[PDB]
Amino acid sequence: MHLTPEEKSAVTALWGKVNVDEVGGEALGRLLVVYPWTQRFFESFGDLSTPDAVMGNPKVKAHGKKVLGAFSDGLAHLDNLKGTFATLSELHCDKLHVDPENFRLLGKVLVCVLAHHFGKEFTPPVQAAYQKVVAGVANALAHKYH
Amino acid sequence: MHLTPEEKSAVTALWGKVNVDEVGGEALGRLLVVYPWTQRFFESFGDLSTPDAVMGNPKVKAHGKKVLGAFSDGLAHLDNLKGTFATLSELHCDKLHVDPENFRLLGKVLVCVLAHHFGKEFTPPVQAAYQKVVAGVANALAHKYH
Amino acid sequence: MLSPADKTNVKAAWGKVGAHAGEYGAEALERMFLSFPTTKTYFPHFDLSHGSAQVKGHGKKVADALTNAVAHVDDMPNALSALSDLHAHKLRVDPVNFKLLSHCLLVTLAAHLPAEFTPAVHASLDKFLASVSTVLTSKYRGVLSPADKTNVKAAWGKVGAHAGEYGAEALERMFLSFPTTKTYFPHFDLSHGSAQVKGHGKKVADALTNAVAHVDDMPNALSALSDLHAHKLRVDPVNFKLLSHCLLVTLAAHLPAEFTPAVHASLDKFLASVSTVLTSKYR
Ligand code: HEM
Ligand code: HEM
């Protein structure tokens, strides 16, 4: 990916403390709250009328776990993100029609969520490592768009 | 940096009709007019107050020729843009302090200048091939920033 | 942009920041230089090492400016006028950098306000920062001047009856050059010559003709379109800059005589205005 040995360890270490399900639901929920236009893909999910409703929506939470679970699995393949996300990239393009900008928005929200969750432990260098990781993951997911 | 056969031939064929001296002065001049904050790097160039001032300024023309001249060199090395521009990348970062976003803006303007100059000949597929090229060159010039 | 609820949220959050504003500002700056190194190009005259007096000093000035902005949230343009002048005319920081510092201030607030940073406050602070950024960037080129409005009307005039054909070409150029934009049209046949693209191109062109006619009253002229894109189509805002670019290329390809540098600058400002309007109701 290109991240130095110390950046990879900072990333991994913090991620070992992440409840993927909780953070997943929190990040997808905040994405839908902070950038409402991303709700366009989730009308089958039900009530998304208020921040509370979005955060408590069981479909949003379930999708959040699914999305962050795949992200989680991608942290094990930091040297080959494009390869790991190739089929998901094609799926999001050809079948889901998800504008790649959405991945970048999720990345920003995920970083704010880690910062809220971890406070002082999310230091400027740790953020910097995570910024490279979220940009890499978004680039890999957008790679097969045509 | 991968281009399909049709995209590379579109780029090459068109570039052979380009008078670098002329197109270079035009592109740099328009960049300074359309995005005036870019003038922060050319305080010693003289009078940049009005469009006609910028467009006829001999130093702007001289510089545009140098810039497109180097861009032309990159066209001959479409397969390795990063390697070709590394020296200039470090130079733009370390000694000149040029925000890489300026490379993207110049790319937009150059596309407008090519459409303006060639008219009907700058077809949608040809523009699309040129968009890949200016994005590649901009990424190649920002590669050594740190 | 900001609703009263948003203002109450920002006021609350920033209040809690209190005496730490200066320290948070320095941390946000440090976070920006590290996460986004291209931002250092604007500070080559600073000692950018951790804890420098220069970064701490600057951090306090930035936070005092946001405090001023919070305190005059209903009158931001005026409260920050000297700052927008300094950034537009002296500093000339590319506007893309404001989103970067905004994200880093947001991450800083998140790390320091565990109780206060709820989803609603997060959304409000994000909108607040985007508004501050917009204010500090408003005078780079400014609103449309009479020369601009005159240039746009003259150029759009020459387009005339070709408007729909140019709108279609602009869409075609956009789809080919920026493939991601195709994600919003999975129901269309996007092949060259497509009647659906031609028909849609005509609609975009007519909206723009309408915007040119109402250049001094754009927000109302485009109100229904803003609602439509904001709440029904929900097109990510970044895409508007891509279609604007493609429209400019189409105009250049067809107006050999009128696409002078000054007209180019006026049209770009005009399209950025139409884009701002079409996206004003997103949040
Ligand atoms: C880190 C970024 C993301 C990753 C790794 C990710 C991962 C996934 C995975 C693993 C699936 C299921 C694939 C399958 O069923 O075969 C999926 C489905 C989906 N994704 Fe993504 N995605 C990401 C971001 C997004 C974003 C930001 C959006 C839209 C705002 C989005 C919208 C969807 C939708 C609508 C589906 C289909 C859900 C369903 O059929 O129930 N994805 N994605
Ligand atoms: C298309 C991308 C670009 C290329 C290939 C390019 C190329 C060059 C070249 C060949 C030089 C001469 C260096 C030397 O004398 O050793 C140079 C200098 C310079 N470039 Fe770039 N450049 C590009 C874009 C930009 C942009 C958009 C800006 C900022 C608006 C910029 C600002 C400068 C400045 C300030 C100098 C110094 C001029 C002087 O000595 O007064 N460049 N560039």
Ligand code: HEM
């Ligand atoms: C949204 C946040 C921003 C605010 C509120 C802000 C505020 C300020 C303030 C209060 C000053 C000092 C005024 C003076 O001493 O006369 C200043 C200076 C400056 N700003 Fe900004 N700014 C913002 C974003 C940016 C960005 C994103 C950059 C570029 C990365 C930037 C670069 C600078 C520079 C280079 C200076 C002059 C520094 C010096 O020489 O002391 N600003 N800004």
Ligand code: HEM
């Ligand atoms: C600033 C330029 C834009 C203008 C002036 C504009 C104008 C319009 C107009 C007039 C309509 C027809 C509405 C109706 O049928 O009542 C519309 C529909 C639509 N627009 Fe935009 N729009 C703009 C940019 C965009 C962009 C950048 C995208 C996406 C890349 C987009 C995607 C759509 C979609 C998906 C439709 C629905 C088409 C259909 O299903 O028939 N728009 N727009």
